[PDB]
């Protein structure tokens, strides 16, 4: 009766590709790609920089790196379980 649904300009795979590019930039380069050229940095070193941003020394991140990685992986898994288990 005269109603039409126009498709979005960006399809779901291209929006997913944009999110993938953002994830790759924030993983391989930290915040450098958002302010200019993407500068590579190891991810523990990037996490240490983020630790300094919140006022915690780098040594705390490096000494407890396995624990921090395990906690991060567990939290990401809990996020997937919580999304899969909550309607």
């Amino acid at each position: 009766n005269g109603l039409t649904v126009l498709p979005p300009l960006l399809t779901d795979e291209m929006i997913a590709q944009y999110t993938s590019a953002l994830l790759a930039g924030t993983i391989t380069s930290g915040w450098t790609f958002g302010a200019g050229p993407a500068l590579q940095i190891p991810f523990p070193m990037q996490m240490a920089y983020r630790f300094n941003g919140i006022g915690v020394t780098q040594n705390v991140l490096y000494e407890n790196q396995k624990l921090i990685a395990n906690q991060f992986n567990s939290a990401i898994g809990k996020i997937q379980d919580s999304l899969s288990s909550t309607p």
Binding site: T32, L39, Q40, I41
Partner: protein, 49 residues
């Protein structure tokens, strides 16, 4: 099909960092509307003259 952008594989490794040796002072423009035209309509004069 529209290209999202140029591919840029960042050369990530566990012991390599990229440090800038120079800088660019970049000035960019941001245009923001603030106000509109203040219009008043006499309802009696518009409908009835």
């Amino acid at each position: 099909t529209m290209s999202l952008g140029a591919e840029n594989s960042v050369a990530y490794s566990n012991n390599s960092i990229a440090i800038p040796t120079n800088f660019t002072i970049s000035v960019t423009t941001e245009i923001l509307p603030v106000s509109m035209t203040k219009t008043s309509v006499d309802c009696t004069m518009y409908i009835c003259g």
